[PDB]
Every structure is written in C-alpha cells, then in structure tokens.
C-alpha cells in the first residue's frame, strides 16, 4: 500500500520520498541560531534553520534535499511547514513572557506564491500571535530577480504586523536600489564582507556599508562572527546586530543567554 511504499522508498535514500514523508511525520528538525543585539534590543532574536533527518536518523545534506525539493515542486510546502512550526513555538514562548522573535527564510518559490499571504494571515490569527514576532528573510538574489513579487509581499507582511529582511546583502550591482521598493526593517549583509578584515580597505568597505544602511534607517545584521577580533571590529563599525558560531552556533534549543537590557 502507498504508505508502506513511501516509507520503503525513503528508507532507500530516495530524497523526494524522504521529503514527502517528512512533511507528514515531522521528520524535519528546526534549529535556532541567536542573533545578538549590540544596540539594546530587548527581544530574544533567533534565526531558524531547517534540517532533514532520514528514517535512520541521519541528517541529509541540505544541498541535496534543497535540490530534490525544487525538482519535486515541494519548496512552498516546506516553507509552510517551517512557518507553521515557527508560529507554534513562538506562541508558546511569548505566552511564557519570553520576548522572542524569529527570522524565517522564504525560498524564491514562496516569494512567487500568491497563496502565501492569505494562508499566512490565518495561520497567524489561529495562534493569536503577537505583533512583530516574525521576520521573514529573503535573499538578495531572490528579491532582486523578483522585485515585483518582493515589493508586494513585503507590503502584505507589513499589513500583517510582520517584519522582513534581506540577507546576503551587497553583492548585486546596485544593492541599495532594490531597497527603494521593499518594506524591510533588517538588512543582513553577505558574509564575504566579513572576510579578510585585517585588510584596512575591507574595514572601510564594511564601515561604509553599515553606514549607508543606518542612513537608510536599516538595522544592520552582520553574520560569520568567528572571533573576538571580528566581534570588536563589528562593534566599532556600528553594526546593530551580529551572529556567528563564536556567539553561539545553531541549536535545537532556544536556550541562549541574551543580555541587552
């Protein structure tokens, strides 16, 4: 019978079967990586990260399950799973007085999905989720390729009391242009700007980027903090938020000791 066969195929390493089954059995796993506030944000900010386990409990490479997801047309549905579970956890936390906020990725498929907003509206209401508890994170490349969808989407999220962010910012031709049309409070700059910081020029480039962002009234998020050296440099440069294994890596628990007033 069908269930027996799906299960058999998944056991065989057919990642498409693994994905189809995981949506129906919670065989995904959410991880959370703290976003650290340098400028006095009270919120407990976490980025959510998705992992997939195969039936034998081992993790399947994201690159491979991402690939299989596009091919089986499963991307929008995966985002929904993450969004739904993110909403659930966030309701339970906020109810226990935790000021927690989650950054959630949207794939380009979801970016182009007219059904997202309507469905989202009811997922939020069903959980009676507090205002501005969710930040949707869209990669620069995607928001750029589909600027029309991105403007519309971010307008909708606004109306829903949701925030938004662009990640991997600053690699396009004119990064700051796409910002004109979009409704985003957060800009998460690409980790390539955090490479070779010893070089004074990279230092200036970073500082200038962060400066332009604060000019456009954006909150800057700088990732890939792997050392004290880089943490200090980012603080000096005036980054509003930072993230990195050095602060804390991804964890299945939201147990981070945020300290920001």
> What's the CA gap between 68 and 58, in Å, rounded?
17
Q: Is 49 annotated as a binding residue?
A: no
3-state secondary structure 29-97: EEEEEEEEECCCCCCEEEEEEEEEECCCCCECCHHHHHHHHHHCCCHHHHHHHHHHHHHHHHHHHHHCC
Our CA angle for 188, 48, 40, nearest 5°, is: 55
Distance CA 79, CA 28 (A): 11
Among candidate residues 68, 43, 25, 12, the one with its CA nearest the CA of residue 219: 43
Question: Rounded CA gap, 187 and 213, in Å?
Answer: 8
Tell whether 41 is in a known binding site.
no
Neighbouring C-beta atoms of residue 131, cutoff 10 Å: 10
190 is in an annotated binding site: no
* 224 annotated ligand binder: yes
DSSP secondary structure code for residue 168 in this structure: E
Q: Phi, psi at residue 51, to the nearest 5°?
A: -125, 150
Asked whether residue 241 is marked as a ligand-binding residue, the answer is no
In 3D, which of 188, 101, 102, 113 has the Cα closest to residue 150? 113
74 is an annotated ligand-binding site residue: no
Q: Is 168 annotated as a binding residue?
A: yes
User: Is position 51 annotated in a ligand binding site?
Assistant: yes
On whether 124 is known to bind a ligand per the annotation, the reply is no
CA-nearest of 75, 104, 78 to 89 is 104
Binding positions for 3',3'-c-di-GMP are 33, 50-51, 79, 168, 224, 226, 245
Binding positions are 14, 33, 47, 50-51, 79, 168, 224, 226, 245
Binding positions for Mg(2+) are 14, 47
């Amino acid at each position: 019978n069908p269930a027996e066969e799906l299960a058999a195929a998944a056991q065989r390493g057919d990642v498409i079967a693994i994905l189809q089954q995981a949506l129906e059995t919670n065989s995904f796993r959410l991880l959370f990586q703290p976003v650290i506030s340098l400028r006095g944000d009270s919120h407990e900010n976490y980025e959510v990260l998705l992992r997939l386990l195969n039936p034998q409990g081992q993790e399947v490479p994201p690159a491979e399950f991402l690939h299989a997801a596009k091919e089986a047309g499963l991307a929008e549905k995966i985002d929904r799973w993450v969004i739904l579970n993110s909403i659930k956890l966030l309701a339970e936390h906020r109810a226990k007085g935790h000021q927690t906020k989650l950054f959630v990725h949207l794939s380009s498929a979801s970016l182009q999905d007219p059904g997202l907003l309507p469905w989202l509206g009811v997922a939020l209401k069903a959980a009676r989720l507090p205002p501005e508890s969710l930040v949707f994170q869209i990669s620069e490349a995607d928001a750029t390729s589909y600027l029309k969808q991105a403007k519309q989407l971010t307008q909708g999220l606004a109306t829903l009391h949701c925030q938004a962010a662009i990640s991997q910012f600053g690699c396009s031709l004119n990064p700051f242009n796409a910002l004109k049309h979009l409704t985003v409070q957060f800009i998460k700059i690409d980790g390539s700007f955090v490479q070779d910081l010893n070089q004074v020029e990279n230092q200036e480039i970073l500082k200038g980027l962060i400066a332009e962002l604060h000019e456009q009234q954006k909150l800057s998020i700088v990732p890939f903090v792997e050392s004290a050296s880089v943490l200090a440099t980012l603080w000096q440069a005036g980054a509003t938020y930072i993230q990195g294994y050095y602060l804390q890596g991804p964890s299945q628990a939201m147990d981070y000791d945020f300290s920001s007033g």
